[PDB]
Structure formats: structure tokens, C-alpha cells
A paper describes a structure:
Toxoplasma gondii is one of the most significant parasites that impacts human health, with estimates that as many as one third to one half of the human population are infected. The genes encoding these enzymes were cloned, proteins expressed and purified, crystallized, and crystal structures were determined.
Phosphoglycerate mutase II, an enzyme at the core of the glycolytic pathway, catalyzes the transition from 3-phosphoglycerate to 2-phosphoglycerate, an important preparatory step upstream of enolase and pyruvate kinase. The P21212 asymmetric unit comprises four PGM chains [~0.4 Å root-mean-square-deviation (r.m.s.d.) over 240 Cα atoms] assembled in two dimers with BSA of ~1,900 Å2, while four chains bury a surface area of ~ 6,800 Å2. A sodium ion-binding site (e.g., NA 301/A) was identified during structure refinement. The tip of the tail possesses the sodium ion-binding site.
Residue numbers in the entry:
A (entry chain D): 17 to 248
B (entry chain C): 15 to 257
C (entry chain A): 12 to 257
D (entry chain B): 15 to 259
Write the structure that this text describes.
């Protein structure tokens, strides 16, 4: 009843179509992904939503989603803050591999666990591997110890919260209308916190792609209600 | 001397109002389709010659902001921080903003507009605080004190408004070792160049910065230009300067 | 005066006496410390702010020890040590060029008595400039390593000081006030005269008569548009009249 | 073992409650006169060895903040930016804060407190939101979401609360080439050290950081410790370690 927060998950990426684990792989949006953001922007525009600051991960797919939304809402003048803390969950040694070839290699049960589990991460990369963010110039200014070799949702949540408490939440408290453009697991991290969901309950939480999720929060940042801005 | 640092400046391409032959100033109009493509072309040239960036500075006007995004996209630099500031905005055209050039030329005279357009210290007629074109009435600038928001501006004012941002943000980034990109407008960039090259008040009037062409500055240890150049062959560049 | 209310409250304070104020010597950007009396003026200003219940959310200071320590002392005495403090060379004292470090008598005998009165009280006539080879030039000082040399003065008149202060007002101080933050500004005589000149829309001629006393909180009650509704010092009319005379 | 960066850590000296033999935690108590002087002495040692700083990090508790200012004053480094954060605060002692050791011994028992004091993952009894010692009720933390403010903490929680600040601010400054100073507390510094030296959960329990003594870390290109040392002779240092034992 006091503050309004808008969250959005980027649309389909090239690897979502190629049926391959992405994680921190910095792949671009597919043409369909680019358009989901254009549609979400129009809906926000129609309802008169406006923003004062935007937060994003550092992955192209989220960054472009955010730019598209600002463009479609006439909010290109606002500051945009990116952080690796809003990045998708890192899939370790599975990143870049096709899901079928990994399912046939490791088994259908084991991948379902790695995909939908809360605290069991996929096999870790080695520091010599090029998929390790520690070897990527994009993370040059981030200490290597903070860059994951692999992650379970749990790790993702713990890595996201600090950014919520140190940047996002304070902006809301300062009176700013905030937009957050991120990924499925990163956003599940925020929602888990916002709605105080249990470890078991977030496993069933599915955040649809390219649909604005609006949170009406009270004076103490507790949700009064939430809803998606569409009719599909 | 020799280059120690590299700075890249870029002026946004054509806007809808450039085609509609209308004074823009702080009017937040979008790029035309041709303007969007000039940025794509400038990105490729930067990509080809191996330019990379660590931070990007922009005005708060859509035109420049989108030009910047396009260049980062085309150079695979979408991960970098982007900082916007009203200080990099185009020169404010006062009471002329939104008016067609022919209709103002016929109203006020061909001489008087030429003065207001290419003069250094004579600004166009000022707006009143009641006018909606005054940034002080625009929510975009709600966090900026109204005293800093112009009613009108001459190039001189624009230069004075830009320098502080150069000294407080852009230059320090260069000094910190960061490869900087600046996406702004004609007059705001003339402001930086005037300072960089220590141009006189009279000389900057002849300075014409072509639209959608990266301008690269090789600076020494003390931020003084060793040389500058545009990323385009003499053929394409000659045609861009003439427009 | 105006009977309206304050929307915002801003507190400005000029640091107390420095070692060189006693040595009767031009300081400018020379980073000299406060005298023991200077340290105590800040303790007294803190107590007055404490008694009236003033609280702060952020503090702005120059990068000169003198102002910095004044600010720390005030935060300590008001139980505001938890707030962010932002420093900037833009709030530095006016730079006195080639006069910095010299005694008044020895500069008066060297350059002339009246010429110094002009350099000290004038608005637009600066003192003789330093050379880039001189150590008193901030461009050679590690303290300003991250600030482009072109921005660092060789000398300054009040006018120059005002022009370098304003941007910091518009880019940091004012926005904090607009965000709803109770701001404290600990700086120097000329830098504060710069802010006041702007706040009260004073003329070039009028700011020459403006004397800001040392170690006395100056409170500004500003309206929604940052225009002064009224201002006042936290001191009895007795101690205050004596502070202004100095 | 090739050092590149230098980091200086300092634990504030004695507080009024250290003398009054009482659990402090987030209680914002001031330094004792002896505490103020330890910082003056640490500043002189840093001054003598020529240490200079480019930025300083601190908790938001007066005792640490004043320690930092004193060190900057004594090293002629008052011009540098100082960033404070609740993330560097002392460990929060939950329901034990404000209690005297005798008063806690009489009301919680000698065994339970020894566990709460030297344990890694078992926190002291938690406060209720209706308790005034909960930071959520303190204006100092007005700009920090209440969900982040502890009701109680074990060293483990402290560590988890500190790391993000290390990775988001302190470390990047070191990587940017800045000479950093960190003025904080016993448990918050044990957090950093535990990470820096990759100490095990069991080993940090024996780690004792003396008060008012600069701790210098020589780190390699990848922020890994090459070596560390205190600015004090083995004689004066032996006596400081016994004080903190
Ligand atoms: Na890295
Ligand atoms: Na405004
Ligand atoms: Na410098
Ligand atoms: Na709070």
C-alpha cells in the first residue's frame, strides 16, 4: 500500500531453443525473447508505470531486456545498475551441454535433481576451465573467490540477498520506483525472501518469462499483494 | 609525447526532429531509423579496430542513451556501467524548442537565428518558469535543483555546465585506467573538445562534429591530446562533415 | 521575517582557528591542523547542536584536515558517527596562490599593505599565481592524484572559488537535501561564502561584507524549492556579536 | 609467494564496557581513554613505517569509527574517503548484550555462555522484535531493511554477513590498487581473516586478534596472503596476545 516494485524475467535465449544449460554463459536473446520484452514494455506503458532506477544482472539477455523495457516506457533517462549478484544460477560443468546428451550420460534422475533441487549443485568446474567466470574479463573487477565453480539454488539465494539489502531495498525505501530485470533463479531468490517462502515451496515457484510481476509493498517492505501484468 | 590513454566520443545520429526540421534542445525525442543505424555502423568500426570499454558516459536524453546502448551491444560491452547526467545534455534552445526552423526564420529573420544557432555567448529567447518545456517542470529532473536547469542556453553556458562532469567523472575514470566511451550531443561534445584541445571561443564556432562517427582521442599522462581522429576513410568522412 | 515553515534544515559550519591563523599566515589549500582552540570550538558547536536535538543523515566536507576534523568532532558530539561523510576538493578554502605560507607582515612588506587588502577582500582579483614546479600547487600533491590537474588552481579569487563550489552544491549537497536528508556541511570561510551567496542570491558586492564566524553552526531553513525561509546561528547574541567582530 | 598488495586491519582498543566486564555486541558504547590511546599509538607505528592509505573501511559503531579517525589523523590521511557499514559491526550477542559477566553467569549459567562465547555455530539466545537492543528498533539502522538486522549471531552468521562487504567493496579497492585500512572489531576481523587464510571452522576459534595493533597483510595478485604480521616487537606483541587471551 506504499511502494511498487516491478520484476521481470528475460525472455527466451538462443540456448533455451538449442535445449542447452546456460547459467552464466553470456548468450543473447532469441528474436522471440527480444519481443517478449517489447510486449512487457507496452503493458507497463499502458498502465502508466514509471521508474526511477533499474537493476539488472550483467548478462546480456537481462541487460537488453531492461533496455527494451525502459525504451518502451520512455524511461531511458534513469540510472541502471548491474551486478553479477543478479546473474542466473551458475550450472557448473553442465554449462554449454545439451540436456538430452547429459540426461543420457548421467541419467534422468540425477539431472532432475541438479535442476530442481534446492541444495545439491551440479558438478563443479575446475579453475583451468574457460567457463569459470574467474577467467572472464567481464569479472575482472570481482574477486575470484566470489565467482562460483557451480551453484545450487541455495547458493544463488545467498548471493542475491545481499544485493537486495544493500541496493534494491534501500532504493525502495528512498521512495524510488524500482525495476528489476534478471533471471529465473535470481528472481526466485528475491521472491523467496519477499513472500517468506520455505526451502520446499520455492521449488514449485515458476516465474513466467517476459511478464512483469508487480509487488505492492507496505511501509516495512512486506508484500500487500502481487500480480502479473497480462491476460494470456 | 605518446599515447597513454584512449577516449572515444560519439555524437548520436539523426533524430525524428532533425528530419522534421525542428529545434530540439532538451526535448527528449527519439532517433530516426537512420539515426539507429549510424550507431550500428559506428559499433562495427569500433569492433573491427579492436576497441573495448570499461565504462560509458551519456546524457539523459533517449537519443544519446540509445546510441550508447547500440555501441555497447555491437562491441560486446553490455556488461559495463553506464553513467548518465543532465550535464551531457544537448544545448537547451529556450523558447525555440519545438518550433520549425523555417517558421522561426520567417518570424524572427534569417540573421537572428543564425546568431542564436552558431553564436558562442548569445542565447535564444528564454522560457518562463510556467512553460512546460522548462526542465524544472519535468519529472525527469525532479532530483536536480531547479536553479541548475536552464531557461535557455548559448554554447558558453553549455560548456560551463559540461566541464564539471568532465573533471568530476569522465577524467578521473580515464586516470583510473579505464577505457571510456562518451555518447552525447553536438554542443555538449564541442564543450569537451574545446577543453581538450584548448580551443578559443572563436575557434569552436568552426568546429563541426559529424554525427554517428567515433572520434578517438589519444591522450598523454596529463590528459593532453597527443592526436585525434575519426574512424572513417577520407571519402565517407568528407561527406559526413559536409552535412 | 517570513512566517512560513521549513521543509528542510541545512547546517553549515566553518572550522575554528588553525595553527597558521595564530601565526598570522595565509593558508589557502595548505593542509594545516586546527589549534587547540580550533578543536574546542567544534566541541562547543557540537554541544549546542546536541542540546537543540539536531540530527544528521550525511555530512559533506572539504578534503583539508581542518574541516575534516571539525566535522568528525561535531558528529562525535551529536552521536552521529554512523553517517556517511563525503569529502571534496570543491569545498576547499580559497587557494591563495604565491601568498600561501607567508606571514602577513612579510607579504605586506614584500607586495604592499593595500595590495594585500585587495587580494584578501576583493571578489575578482586573485593573488599572484604559483608555477607548476611549486610544491604548493595541488597538481603536485598526492592528495589530488585522482583529480585532473586542469581543475587544480594556481591561485584563486572569491569568484573562482564560488564557481568551483556551485557544481558540488547542485550535484551532491542539494540533491541530498531534496532526498529528505538532514545535511551537515563542514568547510571554510570562502567556500561557505560561496554557498551562502547562492542560497541568499547575494550580489558580488554584498558577499564582500558577509563574515561567517568560526565554530558557530549556521542553520538554514529552506523551502520545498531550496529557497531560504530564514537562517540563524546557534549562539547567544552576546557571544555571537563578539564572534562576528573577529 | 610474491606480494603485490598491502592491507592493514585494526581492532579498536578497549571500550567502557570492556572495563565494566560486559557483553557489548552492537551496543554503541564509546572507547575508554585507554582505547583512544591505543589508536594513537597504532597511528604512530604506521607513521614511522611510512604506511599511507587511499581509502578506509569501518563499521558504524563509534568505537571503530573513532579508532579509524584517530589513525587517519596520526598518519596525515584525513583526506581519504571512509566507508562505514553495519556489515563490519561486532558480532551481535542477542539476549546477552548489556549484561555483566556475573549477571549472565547467574542468569544463563556458566556452561551455556562458554558455549555461546567460544562456539562457531551456536548463537546466544535471540532477542524479540519488542526488545530495544534489536537494531531494527534503532534509528541508526533506519536505512537498512529490518530483515537484515540480527536478533542474535554466532560467529558463523557474522562471517556470512561480513564476506559480502569484502567482495563488494574492500577487495575491489585492493584490486584497483588502493592502499586500504579496515578499522573494525574482534569477530568481524576474525571473519575476514578466516577467509583470507582459509581457516577451518574449528581453527578460527583459537584465533585471537589483539586490540590496537595494526595487522598487516601482504597479498598476492589474486588476493591470497603471502604473509601477515603485527606492527609490534615480539616483546610488546607477546603481552598484547596474553591480554586478549
Ligand atoms: Na575476476
Ligand atoms: Na527539478
Ligand atoms: Na592530480
Ligand atoms: Na531498519
Amino acid at each position: 500500500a506504499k511502494y511498487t516494485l516491478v520484476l521481470i524475467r528475460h525472455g527466451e535465449s538462443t540456448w533455451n531453443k538449442e535445449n542447452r544449460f546456460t547459467g552464466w554463459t553470456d548468450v543473447p536473446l532469441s528474436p522471440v525473447g527480444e519481443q517478449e520484452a517489447v510486449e512487457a514494455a507496452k503493458a507497463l506503458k499502458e498502465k502508466g508505470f514509471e521508474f526511477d532506477v533499474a537493476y539488472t544482472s550483467v548478462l546480456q539477455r537481462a541487460v537488453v531486456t531492461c533496455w527494451t523495457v525502459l525504451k518502451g516506457t520512455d524511461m531511458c533517462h534513469i540510472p541502471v545498475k548491474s551486478s553479477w549478484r543478479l546473474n542466473e544460477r551458475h550450472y557448473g560443468a553442465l554449462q554449454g551441454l545439451n540436456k538430452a546428451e547429459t540426461a543420457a550420460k548421467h541419467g534422468d534422475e540425477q539431472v532432475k535433481i541438479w535442476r530442481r533441487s534446492y541444495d545439491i549443485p551440479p558438478p563443479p568446474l575446475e579453475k583451468s576451465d574457460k567457463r569459470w567466470p574467474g577467467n572472464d574479463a567481464v569479472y575482472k573487477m570481482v574477486p575470484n573467490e566470489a565467482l562460483p565453480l557451480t551453484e545450487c539454488l541455495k547458493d544463488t539465494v545467498e548471493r542475491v540477498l545481499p544485493f537486495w539489502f544493500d541496493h534494491i531495498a534501500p532504493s525502495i525505501m528512498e521512495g524510488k520506483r524500482v525495476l528489476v530485470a534478471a533471471h529465473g533463479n535470481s528472481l526466485r531468490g528475491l521472491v523467496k525472501h519477499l513472500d517468506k517462502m520455505s526451502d520446499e515451496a520455492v521449488l514449485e515457484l515458476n516465474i513466467p518469462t517476459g511478464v512483469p510481476l508487480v509487488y505492492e509493498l507496505d511501509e516495512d517492505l512486506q508484500p500487500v499483494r502481487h500480480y502479473y501484468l497480462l491476460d494470456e
